């Protein structure tokens, strides 16, 4: 795996060993051959199981999920995906890693799109090795690959709202289900009613993530609620996964507008992760998969493509040159290599639109590249009526860093500043000059 100009596809099953038992392995061979080593992890969670799977090893921990004092004697580096593309985004030396690691390599976000982009691009180049790690590669067509122990795998309908009847099988059941859900909305309304119904629920979201998660360790539970970050790396000590097989998908409308549509099918990939989830343990067998749809190939056309292209086109490679997406995953956008490059100071104001203003990638392109300063939130204000931000069914209304009270009226609308209470609220400070 560790000759240059290698790039390896390491996709054993879900389970299979590729975190705990592998990627040890893969440090010490890179250790002894002298390469300068990237681990890339999808989440802050799944660092602190990977100094666990690598404590004593040299390693670099480039992440405050970590508690550790760097001796600088490392040649291995391990930060998330998001921190990799960011350092490259910003003006500070990243390291021409020799092997470059990434652990849940199917991760959709993005920062790990791009990632993978500029990583098989030097490899491409001869100038790197690099180890892809995921059970499901891109264009994967198997929702059901191999597991540790045999699984019941049940077509059945899910509820994705309150019920009063008609899914007994729901909560006759006296194990732990991991239940994957469409959206942050969709998870309140069933965690609502499993609660009702006398259930331990923990809600899992990208914005909750680490500090939820620790609940699935630190108490009993009876279903964890959570949408596809739990695709990452996640793991429960479930014996059941309940997935509507459904998920969101940013859509850009004529270059103008970002909705969030569906809830529409997952991908063979998204349910095979989804399932695997459970299964994982050879010395208990019965665990159970329940799915209430089909897959689809809903990543084409996905603005996660799009966005990883504007990333892309915004990193340093050589000179004019520009990182390629990942082959397999390089046609799910309609977009030319630079097309979203731009001059230096618009650079600098999407990555700090991006890194403090916490915005997607999508919107603060379009707030970049209108030549619009950071700290400039007129925009927020001076849209279209039908780009009126609601709450509770009324405009969504803030005070401006001026002390006037305004209605929410962004020039772009992307779905994502407002998908759920906790966005909303976010956008609301950004708007009022808050960060
Ligand atoms: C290249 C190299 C030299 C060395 F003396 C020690 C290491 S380490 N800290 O990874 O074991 C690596």
């Not at 002894?32 to 199981?49: D, G, S, Y």
């Not at 909305?185 to 993530?209: D, H, M, Y």
């Not at 299964?279 to 897959?295: I, L």
């Not at 956008?333 to 990555?351: M, N, P, S, W, Y």
Request: charged share 25%.
């Amino acid at each position: 795996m560790l000759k240059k100009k290698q790039l390896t596809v390491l996709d054993l099953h879900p389970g299979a060993g590729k975190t705990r038992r592998v990627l040890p392995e893969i440090v010490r061979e890179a250790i002894k051959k002298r390469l300068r080593t990237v681990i890339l992890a999808p989440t802050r969670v799944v660092a602190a199981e990977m100094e666990e799977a690598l404590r004593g090893l040299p390693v670099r921990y480039m992440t405050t999920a970590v508690n550790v004092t760097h001796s600088g004697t490392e040649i291995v580096d391990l930060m998330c995906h998001a921190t990799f593309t960011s350092r490259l985004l910003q003006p500070i030396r990243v390291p021409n890693y020799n092997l470059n690691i990434m652990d849940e390599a199917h991760f959709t976000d993005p920062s790990s799109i791009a990632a993978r982009g500029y990583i098989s691009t030097r490899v491409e180049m001869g100038e790197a090795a690099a180890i892809f790690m995921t059970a499901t590669p891109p264009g994967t067509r198997d929702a059901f690959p191999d597991s540790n122990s045999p699984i019941m795998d049940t077509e059945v309908e899910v509820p994705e709202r309150a019920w009063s009847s008609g899914f007994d099988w729901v909560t006759d059941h006296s194990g732990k289900t991991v239940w994957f859900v469409p959206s942050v909305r969709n998870g309140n309304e069933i965690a609502a009613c499993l609660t009702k119904a006398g259930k331990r629920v923990i809600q899992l979201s990208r914005k909750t993530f680490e500090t939820e998660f620790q609940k699935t360790k630190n108490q009993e539970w009876d279903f964890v609620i959570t949408t596809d970050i739990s695709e990452m790396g996640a793991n429960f000590k479930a014996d059941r996964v309940i997935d509507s097989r459904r998920c969101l998908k940013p859509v850009i409308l004529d270059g103008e507008r970002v909705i969030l549509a569906g809830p529409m099918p997952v991908t063979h990939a998204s349910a095979a992760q989804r399932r695997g989830r459970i299964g994982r343990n050879p010395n208990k067998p019965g665990d159970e998969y329940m799915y209430g749809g089909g897959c689809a190939e809903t990543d084409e056309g996905h603005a996660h493509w799009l966005e990883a292209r504007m990333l892309l086109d915004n990193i340093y490679l050589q000179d004019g040159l520009i990182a390629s997406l990942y082959r397999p995953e390089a046609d799910k956008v309609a977009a030319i290599e630079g097309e979203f490059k731009l001059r230096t100071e618009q650079r600098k104001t999407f990555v700090e639109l991006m890194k403090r203003g916490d915005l997607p990638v999508w919107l603060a392109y379009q707030v970049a590249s209108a030549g619009i300063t950071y700290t400039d939130r007129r925009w927020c204000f001076d849209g279209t009526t039908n780009n009126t931000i609601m709450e509770d069914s009324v405009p969504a209304e803030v005070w401006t860093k001026y002390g006037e009270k305004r209605v929410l009226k962004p020039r772009w609308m992307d779905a994502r500043v407002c998908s759920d209470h906790a966005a909303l609220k976010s956008f609301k400070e950004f708007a009022a000059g808050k960060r």
